[PDB]
């Protein structure tokens, strides 16, 4: 069996890989940040509660001007909010109600939502006719779309339940690059700040590092036990945090190529649905199935705060580009905005 | 507020009104979930009531239904079965002909045991369709049902066999008191299908009318 010899070659190659990662693990992040001063208790309170959805809110995304946010719920609506005024500037009825993701364009021109329809439909907001209309339907994924993220007005990287990620061209509607290698189905995705690369996560309990310019996986990160629901880069673009069903958020370096640290408590047993950082990345927020967001000191592993406003599972949260406020959405059909 | 911010508040108020109207239209309709293994007669069911998730509208006795054939997508269902939390009923199509075909009936029991005891469906009633019963009416006598079911005491023709398959499906739920299972052996040319769906949704509608009325 020649493929058995190939599998032994693969086995000694992964053994050499974890030897190479183990050879550079001279210290932990925890003993480096043992000296640094803790930030204490972050007493965040709800500034605004956004109340217009009638079903479970599955996704949310902040605009780049830190005022408009889109939220997609299962009542067939994605609503774009004015977060300062709690005003709805756009209610968009969806083609399929079963939405699981939403995005906001960095230019602010488009939103893009997708779900069980296998289509990350793209909606033009700055139209001459004044209504929001579908601009492009992106079919081609054979599994449910879990996360789609905008690079530009013309490129969008989508994650789906067919174990592949795809980079699209919005004018053609044809996916230009396919990102294969995940064996389980990909649930989470986050772009780097320079957007030359991104990371994704699946039921392999693995995170993979894909480049949008060439199109292959350069790095694979392992250390979770189950599916990761959540991923978000550090604002430097050199690290990211992954939330899973293991009640463990884990941070990984790109350039050091291993897991650094685990954000776990004994009193948390439910899964993490969303993660995000702050502007500086000192603290990472994390939504839980225990209905509350947990603010973790991303350097000292301590629970710096608890945001317990929601009556159901916190499915989506995000932090503005200004870093002013954190919006958290949840399955009791409310967005709460914390500061 | 200035003039433009007051008009933005007014635009948001009309958007609130349309959201309330559309959620009130979708609150008074019935959302059903087709299931079952492959080629189990589900497509014949959705033909006789009338890429991604397939949706079917039909109004029966002034009651708007929305059927959801979600089975066209092949992914691990634990990551999207909570989207259908809060459906009224779960239409489950089991082929009686797939007892001898290949452990396909055992695959149907695997999927029924998975979703009948699912944590998001601890309350939702399940309509269970046993179709291809005429195909069962020939293939009872060509090959016995003991090749599918390991014990099967007392084999006969079509009556204790169908009742045994009924009883072997019905006890799979570990909580028989919170939820309730409906069953219908059905033909291909009959109006008992959508009639039974109406009369099994009506119990759930009564229970939801009492949940809305604090009871």
């Amino acid at each position: 069996s020649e493929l058995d010899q190939l599998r032994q070659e693969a086995e000694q190659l992964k053994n050499q890989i974890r030897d190479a990662r183990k050879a550079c693990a001279d210290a932990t992040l925890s003993q480096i940040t043992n000296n640094i001063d803790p930030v204490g208790r972050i007493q965040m309170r709800t500034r605004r509660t956004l109340r217009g959805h009638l079903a479970k809110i599955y996704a949310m995304h902040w605009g780049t001007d830190s005022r408009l946010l889109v939220s997609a719920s299962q009542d067939g609506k994605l609503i774009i909010w004015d977060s300062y005024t709690t005003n709805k500037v756009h209610a968009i009825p969806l083609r399929s109600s079963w939405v699981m993701t939403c995005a906001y364009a960095p230019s602010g021109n488009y939103v893009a939502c997708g779900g069980l329809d296998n289509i990350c439909s793209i909606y033009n907001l700055k139209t001459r006719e004044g209504n929001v209309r579908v601009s492009r339907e992106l079919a081609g994924h054979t599994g449910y779309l879990s996360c789609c993220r905008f690079l530009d007005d013309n490129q969008i990287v989508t994650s789906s339940g067919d174990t592949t990620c795809a980079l699209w061209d919005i004018e053609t509607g044809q996916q230009t690059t396919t990102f294969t290698g995940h064996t389980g189905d990909v649930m989470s995705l986050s772009l780097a700040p320079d957007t030359r690369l991104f990371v994704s996560g699946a039921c392999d309990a693995s995170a993979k590092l894909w480049d949008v310019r060439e199109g292959m996986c350069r790095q694979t990160f392992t250390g979770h036990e189950s599916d990761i629901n959540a991923i978000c880069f550090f604002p430097n673009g050199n690290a990211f945090a992954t939330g899973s069903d293991d009640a463990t958020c884990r941070l990984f370096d790109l350039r050091a190529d291993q897991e650094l640290m685990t954000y776990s408590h004994d009193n948390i047993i439910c899964g993490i649905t969303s993660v995000s950082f702050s502007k500086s990345g000192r603290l990472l927020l994390a939504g839980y199935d225990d209905f509350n967001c947990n603010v973790w000191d991303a350097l000292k592993a301590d629970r710096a705060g608890v945001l317990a406003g929601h009556d159901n599972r916190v499915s989506c949260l995000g932090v503005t580009d200004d870093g002013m406020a954190v919006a958290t959405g949840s399955w009791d059909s409310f967005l709460k905005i914390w500061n | 507020l200035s003039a433009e911010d007051k008009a933005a508040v007014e635009r948001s108020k009309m958007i609130d009104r349309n959201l309330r109207e559309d959620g009130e239209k979708a609150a008074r309709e019935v959302k059903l979930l087709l299931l079952g293994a492959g080629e189990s007669g589900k497509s014949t069911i959705v033909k006789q009531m009338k890429t991604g998730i397939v949706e079917t509208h039909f109004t029966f006795k002034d009651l708007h239904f929305k059927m959801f054939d979600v089975g066209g997508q092949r992914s691990e269902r634990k990551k999207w079965i909570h989207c259908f939390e809060g459906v009224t009923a779960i239409i489950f199509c089991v082929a009686l002909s797939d007892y001898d075909l290949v452990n396909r009936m055992h695959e149907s029991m695997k999927l029924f045991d998975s979703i009948c005891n699912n944590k998001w469906f601890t309350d939702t009633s399940i309509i269970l369709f046993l179709n291809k019963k005429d195909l069962f009416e020939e293939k009872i006598k060509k090959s016995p049902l003991t090749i599918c079911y390991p014990e099967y005491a007392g084999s006969n023709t079509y009556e204790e066999a169908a009742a045994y398959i009924q009883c072997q499906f019905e006890d799979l739920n570990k909580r028989k008191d919170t939820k309730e299972i409906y069953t219908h052996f059905t033909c291909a040319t009959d109006t008992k299908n959508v009639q039974f769906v109406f009369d099994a949704v009506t119990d759930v509608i009564i229970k939801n009318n009492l949940k809305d009325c604090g009871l």
Partner: single-chain antibody
Framework: VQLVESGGGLVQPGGSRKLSCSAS????????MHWVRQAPEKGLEWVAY????????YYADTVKGRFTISRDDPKNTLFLQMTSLRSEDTAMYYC??????????????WGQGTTLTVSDIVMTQATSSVPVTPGESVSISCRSS???????????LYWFLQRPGQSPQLLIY???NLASGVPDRFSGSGSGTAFTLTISRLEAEDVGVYYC?????????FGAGTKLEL
């Protein structure tokens, strides 16, 4: 998009007249619509505004009680009902589309205008006519009589260009933001109650009368008009 209007002609004073503007190609139920007239030797003067959904109606003080604005959502038609008219209503009535959410561009589209013949933050244009060199940087200034910088961070000054024989178009909205369909050579800035419109690298077919409009509070008022003449 397109707006067409009708209802002009010779009307006796003291009588009644109904003008009608029908939408074509935009979601007319979602737009708050206005009426702005223009006397044949005088700049623009706002008349009425029925909101989207017909929930909110304002009028100018010179038309309050004599004019009635109402829309029709299925027929996609805005119509204005007048009575007891006089020679001060001898104008050309433009019907203006607008929309109001964050990031919107109100007053972006105007109807083509119909001549009608009958047999308060004041905005001040600093100079009614400036000389034009084609290719020269021209600054057009508007002087308010109130602080248009509202507390929310906005500054509701609007810039319009009425080309000769063509309807006013929105150039710059909220004193700073370019409208869709203007060159980047148009630029406006300023402070509270002090504004300017800088037109660097002036091109041909850009001459006309320029209008500054406040939108801090109703009634909306216009500038007298800054004519650009070669």
């Amino acid at each position: 998009v397109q707006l067409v209007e009708s209802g002009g002609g010779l009307v006796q004073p003291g009588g009644s007249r109904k003008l009608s503007c029908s939408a074509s190609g935009f979601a007319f139920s979602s737009f708050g619509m206005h009426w702005v007239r223009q006397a044949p030797e005088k700049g623009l003067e706002w008349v009425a505004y029925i909101s989207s959904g017909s929930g909110t109606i304002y009028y100018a003080d010179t038309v309050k009680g004599r004019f009635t604005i109402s829309r029709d959502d299925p027929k996609n038609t805005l119509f204005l009902q007048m009575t007891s008219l006089r020679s001060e209503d001898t104008a050309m009535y433009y019907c203006v589309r607008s929309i109001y959410y964050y990031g919107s561009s109100p007053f972006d589209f105007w109807g083509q205008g119909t001549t009608l013949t009958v047999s308060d933050i004041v905005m001040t244009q600093a100079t009614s006519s400036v000389p034009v060199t084609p290719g020269e940087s021209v600054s057009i200034s508007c002087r308010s009589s109130k602080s248009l910088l509202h507390s929310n961070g906005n500054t509701y000054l609007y810039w319009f260009l009425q080309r000769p024989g063509q309807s006013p178009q929105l150039l710059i909205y909220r004193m700073s933001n370019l409208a869709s369909g203007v060159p980047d050579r148009f630029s406006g800035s300023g402070s509270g109650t002090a504004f300017t419109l800088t037109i660097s690298r002036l091109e041909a077919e850009d001459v006309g009368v320029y209008y500054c409009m406040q939108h801090l509070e109703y009634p909306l008022t216009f500038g007298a008009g800054t004519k650009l003449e070669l």
